Amino acid sequence: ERLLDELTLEGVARYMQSERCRRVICLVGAGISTSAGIPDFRSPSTGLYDNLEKYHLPYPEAIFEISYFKKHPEPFFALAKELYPGQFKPTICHYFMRLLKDKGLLLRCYTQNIDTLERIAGLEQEDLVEAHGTFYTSHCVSASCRHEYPLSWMKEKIFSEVTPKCEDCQSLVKPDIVFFGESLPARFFSCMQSDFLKVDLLLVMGTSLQVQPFASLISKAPLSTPRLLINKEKAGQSDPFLGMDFDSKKAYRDVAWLGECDQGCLALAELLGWKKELEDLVRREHASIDAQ
């Protein structure tokens, strides 16, 4: 009555090596980048809305609201210098997704993250839905210009404490993250409408599934599609006050592996016979990055 022979990581691995599992969608959040040193930017414990006093904001969230940014961009860019990562080294989890791509299994990676690590790990634009945009590129904000600038250009402006301006028209240049008040990416809805007709397995890694519309993606899978959560904490279940079903007598397709995302991806790779391939890929790419 179900595609998984048992509701465990071993059941998922056997399903992944069966004829039925052809197309995997990954849904990933901040939990896959914390081991790379990237903090969760939607976590109150990160303290983004603390130490904003010198900027005299009308409300703390204004530093990430598009209309405020366009008139007063300096607070955002001062904060961006403070938080700019010291290195961009993707995690075991990112390279696990590269292995999925290499093996013809990756239909799409939907990511809430803005840190570019999916791209550094070798996922291409076609493979990715960056649901909240990315720092990978930046654009002039003038509608008639829209000159594109790479992250190296934007990094230099952030570190020199020079507000980035377009060389063509002298308008503000903004990283391609989705500020509050901006439209969500058309690609998010377009790809969702196509991909979830085709998916055989949902791999949900490093997201607490608490931010919409991203969290709603789990409800777009066909009823039969197994869903594996790899996360430090169980997530995605229905709210009893107002979903994933891991633990009831009616559970039939959802599996929770609770732990660090890197360790869960390593465990899954090991069951699949991919551990040596994943170790070799990670060690090579990390050595390459360390040598830059």
Partner: peptide, 7 residues
């Protein structure tokens, strides 16, 4: 398209 909000 829907606009990005806190929730």
């Amino acid at each position: 398209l829907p606009k990005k909000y806190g929730g």
